[PDB]
Symmetry: C4
């Protein structure tokens, strides 16, 4: 018996009202200044529009809302009328109520047009849409906000141009007005010439060009220009502020990358490192930026540490499920195993593990070739290998001994890292470490 605020009916009703509001807001100054009122072909359409909003006044009592403290619903139509009658009812029933149609049919005009300028309270619904669409996900945020600013700027042009043409009509002596002193016969021309002339006056003093045509002579008009140029100063400052937000935010990523590269280059050229350490640092920052892992670190560390477990369970479980070491290790162990795996990504020709380094982490390959050569003991050649899926670092499992070989990449790779302390934290989950240790003993003895 109560209409939910997420039906397909009510949302299409709102968007039909939004098109109707845009119609009313475009007509109202153009009706206020140029055209007369006694003819009725637009009077019909205005009365129909007032009928639609009078229907909406009734129908907003049947609609549920979303409360702030308790969520997802408010029903039982008490407190709905308390919400609607306190916040938005008074100005809506002032705006919806016809006054010109009663003045026309009762006895009878300028004081009745000002009562028709209250139709602009209907323009809150456009603000409610541009509040919804920023916060909705499935839209470009830097498109909606510039659309909002273009809407406000175009409406300021329109309303100011029509009000100045009004104050040019109502004044005796057509000469010494802004349009009279240039065109001496202007009331006999069409609507398109007068409307384009008013619009052209208004935009040359909004966008602060100000050629020198169409300046003011009438002192009341000379008074209107003071308030309009104050308003244009304020709005132009606001517009430059929004475009500064769009430019600062659109290019933050590339600027932060170039900061990191400048800092690495100053640190390198200060201490005079030869070539190799420079190329390692700069290529490693280039491949941190091509796979943008900084936002990955932040947004993974903002997750509630169970959804990241389901992420790693999707990504790395069939890779860890088939290794040299793990054979029969009881997948209910693997669910608690997988969730601490921290992926990584590595440049080519970066010496990963050097000879006689004290061990720190397991390096399961997921892709990419690896080339191992003797370091210090062997001047050149020798042997060293590992292929997709084939782990290494299995010396420092429990042997606690340094790595035999050198580890230099050939083509780029993706290397998982279950480190030493993570392994020793996995040690207390016993009765399945026996299978791992049997795989170690039968692995190395063969």
């Amino acid at each position: 018996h109560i209409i939910s605020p997420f039906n397909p009916r009510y949302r299409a009703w709102e968007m039909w009202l939004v098109l109707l509001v845009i119609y009313s807001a475009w007509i109202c100054p153009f009706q206020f200044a140029f055209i007369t009122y006694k003819k009725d072909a637009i009077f019909i359409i205005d009365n129909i529009v007032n009928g639609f909003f009078a229907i909406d006044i009734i129908l907003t009592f049947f609609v549920a809302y979303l409360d702030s403290h308790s969520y997802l619903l408010v029903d039982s139509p008490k407190k709905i009328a308390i919400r609607y009658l306190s916040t938005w009812f008074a100005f809506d029933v002032c705006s919806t109520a016809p006054f010109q149609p009663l003045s026309l049919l009762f006895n009878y005009e300028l004081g009745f047009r000002i009562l028709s300028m209250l139709r602009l309270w209907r323009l809150r619904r456009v603000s409610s849409l541009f509040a919804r669409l920023e916060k909705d996900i499935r839209f470009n945020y830097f498109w909606i906000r510039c659309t909002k600013l273009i809407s406000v700027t175009l409406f300021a042009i329109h309303c100011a141009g029509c009000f100045n043409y009004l104050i040019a009509d109502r004044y005796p002596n057509p000469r010494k007005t802004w349009i009279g002193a240039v065109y001496p016969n202007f009331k006999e021309a069409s609507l398109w010439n007068r409307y384009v002339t008013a619009l052209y006056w208004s935009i040359t003093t909004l966008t602060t060009t100000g050629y020198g045509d169409f300046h003011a002579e009438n002192p009341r008009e000379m008074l209107f220009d003071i308030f309009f140029m104050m308003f244009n100063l304020g709005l132009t400052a606001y517009l430059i502020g929004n475009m500064t937000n769009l430019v600062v935010h659109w290019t933050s990523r590339t600027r932060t990358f170039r900061d990191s590269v400048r800092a690495a280059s100053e640190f390198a050229s200060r201490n005079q490192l030869p070539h190799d350490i420079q190329d390692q640092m700069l290529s490693h920052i280039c491949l941190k930026f091509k796979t943008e892992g900084l936002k990955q670190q932040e947004t993974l560390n903002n997750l509630p540490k169970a959804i990241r477990s389901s992420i790693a369970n999707y990504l790395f479980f069939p890779i860890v499920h088939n290794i040299y070491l793990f054979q029969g290790v009881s997948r209910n162990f693997l669910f608690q195993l997988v969730s601490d795996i921290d992926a990584e990504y590595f440049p080519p020709k970066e010496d990963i593990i050097l000879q006689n380094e004290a061990p720190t982490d397991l390096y399961i390959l997921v892709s990419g070739a690896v080339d191992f050569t003797v370091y210090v003991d062997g001047h050149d050649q020798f042997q060293g290998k590992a292929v997709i899926g084939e782990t290494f670092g299995e010396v420092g499992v429990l042997y606690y001994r340094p790595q035999p070989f050198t580890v230099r990449t050939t083509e780029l790779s993706q290397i998982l890292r279950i480190s030493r302390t993570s392994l020793m934290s996995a040690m207390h989950a016993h009765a399945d470490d026996g299978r791992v240790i049997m795989n170690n003993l039968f692995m190395k003895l063969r």
Copy 2:
């Protein structure tokens, strides 16, 4: 015997002085240029205003202040005169002292008007108010500062317009001035036409429109325009800077939210997660933003860790006071218990606790339904439940064993979390853990 600076008398005295300062600052250029001086109907009011400030000069010796290093008072009127006589006394006694009323009554004028332009030192009190109202809590900060800028801009318009009308009066050959070459008979017109014309000239070169009327011909006036247009360049840059602060600060929250959603969507569409993990991540960020917990985390972690204990004592003590487990647990234990409770809030249909997960935390419900179904062992159906107040996670109290069921939400909930390490930290507070363990044994055996 010494007036405190927080009485209701002295604050109303200051605000009466602020209205008097605004009066003096509006009159002084308008008196300096347009009107004469020999008539006395405003001379009376100016002498009365000088009387009020001469009273304030005496009365500021009886008032205490707030020192910088030691707080809350300085009394004993030594060092009050040392403060007042060193900082603000000289220019105040130069501004308050009448010079035109002595020139009028002594013997007698342009050199005496410049001595009346020193009345603008009285305008420090408006700066002191706009320093107080930013730092006071009970006002909108983005309203006060724009009011300050509108005040400075309007006063610049006013003073520049009146000074240019002065330099147009004092020059012989009324033609070849800015107002003379357009209106040849301008000294015979009223005050309102000349004042609106001067104001209209001034605003078309402050807001950089510059139509082309009212340009300068007199070379001294052509010299005045150089300094005024330098000043307008500086002030327009300052105004755009302040509106850039208001726009960058007004929309930081929505922009940060949309950053987080873009980063989550790039991380999802890079690694090709199917649907479910995308919808979990995006709905969890949407419900971190509807209940803005990031500012909560920051401002709770900036608190001195006793007021947050009183906060949690108000919020969660009658909820934890009535549980399945806790029955008679001696509320002086509960005061030390409650202060480490970390609240949270959760989306619907997010799988909270999965089957055979190694346990991490207690999950006391505070609201919201919970639905538990068999995971892996059971393909569908089965049973699992918990209602408002009914805790779960009571397996991993001391049993150290994985959870039996799956835990999927149905409608959204608020779930407290006293985690495993927090429980084991609460273990050393003994002689009341016996009641908890008896409640465990009689709880599970039934």
Copy 3:
């Protein structure tokens, strides 16, 4: 059989195309408005340019690209045509296709010039270059982006000026146009005068000056100015946003330094420290800023903790290799030793180690003199020394006893710091600590 996208041939082919695109984009409005078409001396060059792009349409099928998910190559020409035929093929084959040369040779003009305005789709390659050069390392980032903005601004001036000269030619009554009412005989003048006049009109309404010459009289031209002044408002806001990024980013370092100095001075002058502690704090921040160690800390702590080991191995191994203590300590121990050394840098006259201070760290000198004097026990003189390479702090190795002397610098120095906990972490690497302890015993006994 497939051309790689990193050959020297294909890159020079692209840059030749970029010069050809700049040629076409400069000619096309200037051809559209001023000159005729029936003559053929430029028609030849345009057909040759269309030939070059028709060659490029074929040749872009033989070129490999870089995929997003898997890197470094895509070969095997399937999916290359799927990439090229879906993204960029349609508008390229619309732009490359000649239509004016077919209109000239088939039967025959304004509707055929608009088909020649589709040559501006060729201007995507300039956007691809200005996307590459920001992300490439070996270029100044704040030079490329301002070059991009100057390019867009100059092209807007050019195209708007030529389009307004077109709409001034095509209108009957040469008077009441923008160039007709000032120059009554303008079609008989040269190209340079008309082109400079159109360019001069366009820039006085792009850069919002607007003198007052050359305003519009024709109502269709009065309509064109509305769209052009809207566009200029948008572009001027965008340009101010980019220069705000350049100014905020160019002076962040000096502003952060001056923040730190202001905060230290307020903390000093609040609590009334006499002189010495002020000069120590301020000179220490000055020598943190002359050797900018903050970016060093950040970019070293962002490194993957093996490249920083190779850095410290290059920088400090021949310094630690020759000390009082270390003599025969088996350089495979030294590789694991060096990587935890944290360098530092110190002001002169800063008291480094005071008398009877509980010990914290080893202080190996690398440069700079050190002067030690008796503290408290000795009023003045006494003795204390250490020279380049000569360590101190060797009391608190295992003696766990306070330092004997005071340590005040004379000229500035660079002092390594292997602290107490780092030494005790190095203790478990035994069978070579015996040599260190023998060097201690024979060191102190002599």
Copy 4:
């Protein structure tokens, strides 16, 4: 034999050169356009200025500099000539060399004035001063940078005005120039009228007003305005960027404070806390902001942890030196004791320690009254006290028992905090804890 770069002689020599450079840069356009050259009264002064710079060319070989990698000196005049002859020698010896005085005395002019426009290379010294004064401590940073921008803007006005007056002189037909069509007789007027007119033209198109006087008619002049208005667009954007930095940086502190208060108020009014917890949170943030402890925390935690020990040794040693507990505790213990003391500051009426709270820290008063009342057991009244210097929290030294009383402030205080873990860390420093424990036993037994 080598002049140090920090003598009082050489710095005064540099500042005399800076005044001479400002003289040359102001004269050179004004000499280039207005005045003739054959008279000699300024020719003398120009030759003298060239003599001063020819002396400086020699004298810059005797001066030491500061190297980048090794600091504080470079002597031994090899590599000084390598620095000076590579970087700055060529353009200095081109600028210093006279060419007009040789043209005047050799045989003989426009091509020789362009050789005199190379005197503007001498203007690097003003850039070196405005690089030094930002980085020097004893100057306001937001004053120097705005002075730099005003200098560049005024010089742009000056040079552009004089160059346009040149291009107005050199053209035949004095009518159809910018100054000719308004003043038909302008070459017969003085210097002040022509100079003010050129300056007034230049500033109305720098500050984008553009009245409508003084527009261009000569096509070469119409070409000059294009480059000058491009330059003014660029410079106006740069100026707005710098004022945006000054406004964003000048009001960051108050804006951050108001952020914290808004976040605390939203967190309070969301969860509906009654009054007391709101007033505690808001008054505690107000007294974190009146004594700005956030910058204190940052800049103390950036210190090298020995200077902060000397700070706490100056601030708190004679306060801790005289307590209830500590009597004879051997001040060489006190030097290691003091350095971990963390000061704090507290609002009035904030309940500091509640009844039956598990203890956390010692609370030595340094000022401010304290009032203790019974909590829960006692409804009202009771007793509780502590005065300046009199510690409390001495229950939980080793008794590990909750506090007896409640602790509510009356007037604001400053309370040191040596916490529980800091005390237990001080426990291993024995052979003087016996005196503390004797003071405990004789303290409580009395």
